[PDB]
C-alpha cells in the first residue's frame with residue numbers, strides 16, 4: 001500500500017451538502033472539497049459512519065483504507081481520502097448518476113440488451129480484479145455498483161470483512177457460517193445480475209430473511225427473469241450452487257458474458273429492443289470527454 | 297465526425313457569463329442528456345455574429361478538426377449547436393484561464409509552477425504544429441487550468457474561418473490580437489507556426505509578469521512601428537538573462553530564425569529541473585509545490601486523463 005494514494009483531510013477542507021442515502025454502516029452525502037488557497041468548490045461524496053472511533057479503533061480503519069485506496073482498475077472505485085474525527089468520514093468520487101439499482105428502476109423496460117449485457121461484463125471484470133488483489137467484496141449488490149456513465153459502471157464499498165446483514169444476496173455458506181470468499185462473492189454476483197435483468201425487483205420479496213437459508217436448503221432459487229434466455233438463466237443458477245467450488249469463476253463469467261454481448265439480441269429478448277437507444281459512438285465520446293477520461 | 301456531437305438546443309442551457317473576447321461570449325452551463333435526470337456542467341461559447349447556413353457548413357468542417365485533437369495539453373471541441381448564432385461546447389474549467397489564475401495568485405506562484413507551465417504550453421503547441429494546425433490567437437487567456445499542475449491550450453484554428461475579412465480588420469477594432477502578433481502577421485494578416493512562436497514568447501512574458509498587459513499604455517495602432525524600430529517587451533524582474541533571451545529569440549524579425557516549439561520544450565524542461573537558478577522570485581523557498589498525495593487527489597477528482 002503506497003500511502004500517498006490516501007489523502008488525509010482536515011475538517012476545514014470539505015462540507016457536507018445534502019444526504020444521498022444510508023446503509024448498514026453509514027450515511028452518504030453530496031459534498032464539496034475546497035483545495036487550500038483556491039476559490040473552487042469540487043463535488044465529492046462523503047460517507048460518515050454511524051459508530052464513533054478511538055485511535056486504536058482508527059488504526060484498524062487506516063490500515064484498511066490504505067488497501068482500498070490502492071485499487072487500480074477501470075471497473076472498481078477507489079477510496080480517495082479520509083477525515084479522522086470523533087466519527088470517521090470517507091471521501092470518494094461523487095457519481096451524479098448514482099447507483100445501478102436506481103438507474104435500472106428509473107429506466108425500467110427502457111434499457112436495451114446491449115447495455116444490460118455490457119454491465120454484467122463490467123461488474124465481472126471489476127470483481128475479477130478484486131480477486132486478483134485477493135480482496136473479498138462481501139457486500140456486492142446492484143446498490144453497490146455505481147454508474148459513472150450509462151456505458152461505464154463501477155464496483156464500490158468492497159472489502160469490509162477484516163473490520164467486522166445482506167441475507168438475500170449472501171451465499172448459503174456465508175449465512176450459516178459467516179464464510180466470505182470469492183466464491184460466495186460469485187453468489188452475490190448471480191443475485192446482482194438477477195436485479196439487472198428484472199430492472200430492480202427485490203429478491204425473494206414475499207419471503208422474510210429469517211427463512212432464506214431454509215428455502216435454499218430446499219433447493220429453491222430466484223425465478224427466471226422474463227427477458228432472459230435459458231443460457232443467461234443457467235449462468236445465474238450456476239452461481240447459486242450449494243458447492244462453492246462448483247460455481248463459475250469470475251474469469252469465466254467475463255468470457256461468457258462478453259461472448260453474449262457480441263450478439264445481445266440472441267441472449268436477451270426485450271420487447272421493442274429496437275425502441276431502445278444503444279451506445280452511440282458519438283454519445284460515448286461525448287460522455288467520456290466530458291465526465292469519464294480514465295484510461296480503460 | 298463521431299468526435300463532434302451535433303447538439304439540440306433543448307439539451308443544454310446557459311447559466312452564467314464567464315467572459316468574452318473578439319468573437320464570442322463564454323458561459324458556464326449544463327448539459328442535460330435526453331431521458332436522464334443529470335445536469336452536467338460544461339462551458340458554452342456563443343459567437344457574437346449570426347451566420348448563414350453556408351457559413352455554418354464551413355464552421356462545421358473546421359469544428360471536426362477542432363474535435364479531432366487528442367493531446368494532454370490541448371483542449372478539444374466537444375459539441376456544436378447550429379443556432380442562428382452558433383454555440384460551442386467544451387469541458388468547463390473551474391480554475392478558469394491561466395491569465396486570471398496567475399493574476400489571482402500573483403504572490404503565491406513559485407518557479408517550478410511557472411516553468412512547468414512553459415513546458416506544457418510548448419508541448420501542446422508542438423502537437424498542433426505536428427498536426428499542422430496554426431493557432432492564430434495564443435495568449436495566456438487561451439490557456440486553461442485543468443488543475444494548477446495541468447494547463448491546456450484552447451481556442452486554436454480560427455484563421456480559415458476569418459480569411460474573408462481578416463485583411464480588413466482594424467488594429468483598434470479588437471478583432472486582431474495585435475500585441476501578441478508577429479510583425480509579419482500585423483503587416484500581412486497571415487499566421488504560421490513561426491508567428492505562433494512569437495505569441496508563445498508574449499504568453500511566457502505574461503506568465504513571468506504574473507499577468508501584466510503587454511505594451512501597456514501603447515495604442516495597438518503604434519505596435520508595428522515600435523517593433524520595426526527594434527523595441528520589445530521589457531525583461532520581467534523575475535527572469536534571469538537566460539529566460540529573457542529565449543523570449544527575445546521568439547521575437548526576431550526573421551520568422552525562420554525564431555526557436556521551434558520542439559526546442560522550446562527541451563530548453564524549458566532543462567530549466568524546470570533547476571528552477572531557482574533561472575527565475576528569481578520573492579519567497580520562492582516557501583512557495584507551494586504539490587506532493588504526490590495532493591496531486592493524486594486532484595487527478596481523481598477532476599483530471600483523470602493524466
Ligand SMILES: O=C(Nc1nccs1)[C@@H](c1cc(F)ccc1O)N1Cc2ccc(-c3ccc(N4CCNCC4)cc3)cc2C1=O
Nearest residue numbers: 025028045046047051068077078079090091092157158163
Ligand atoms: O468509503 C466508502 N464508500 C463511500 N461511499 C460514499 C462516500 S465514501 C467505502 C469504500 C469506498 C471505496 F471507494 C472503495 C471501497 C470501499 O469499501 N468504504 C471504505 C471503508 C473503510 C472502513 C469502513 C469501515 C470501518 C469500520 C467499520 N466498523 C466499525 C465498528 N462497527 C462496525 C463497522 C465498518 C466499516 C468502511 C468503509 C467503506 O464503506
Ligand SMILES: O=C(Nc1nccs1)[C@@H](c1cc(F)ccc1O)N1Cc2ccc(-c3ccc(N4CCNCC4)cc3)cc2C1=O
Nearest residue numbers: 319322339340341355362371372373384385386451452457
Ligand atoms: O469552442 C471554443 N472555445 C470555447 N470556449 C468555451 C466554450 S467553447 C473554441 C475551441 C475549443 C476547443 F476545444 C478547441 C479549439 C477551439 O477553437 N472555438 C471553436 C470555434 C469554432 C468557430 C469559431 C468561429 C466561427 C466563425 C467566426 N467568424 C464568422 C465570420 N465573421 C467573423 C467571425 C469566428 C469564430 C470559433 C470557435 C472557437 O472559438
Ligand SMILES: Nc1ncnc2c1ncn2[C@@H]1O[C@H](COP(=O)(O)OP(=O)(O)NP(=O)(O)O)[C@@H](O)[C@H]1O
Nearest residue numbers: 020021022023024026028045093094095098099143
Ligand atoms: N460515490 C457515490 N456517488 C453517488 N452516490 C453514492 C455514492 N456512494 C454511495 N452513493 C449513494 O448513497 C446510497 C447509500 O450508500 P451506502 O451508505 O453505501 O448504502 P447502500 O450501498 O445503499 N447499502 P450498504 O449495503 O449498507 O452499503 C447508495 O446506495 C447510493 O444511492
Ligand SMILES: Nc1ncnc2c1ncn2[C@@H]1O[C@H](COP(=O)(O)OP(=O)(O)NP(=O)(O)O)[C@@H](O)[C@H]1O
Nearest residue numbers: 314315316317318320321322339387388389393437
Ligand atoms: N472552457 C472554459 N472553462 C471555463 N472558462 C473558460 C473556458 N473557456 C474560456 N473560459 C473563460 O472565458 C473567458 C472568455 O473566453 P473567450 O470568449 O475565448 O475570449 P478570450 O480568449 O478571453 N479573448 P479572444 O482571444 O479575444 O477571444 C476566457 O478568457 C476565460 O476566462
Ligand SMILES: [Mg+2]
Nearest residue numbers: 023143144157
Ligand atoms: Mg454501498
Ligand SMILES: [Mg+2]
Nearest residue numbers: 317437438451
Ligand atoms: Mg479564448
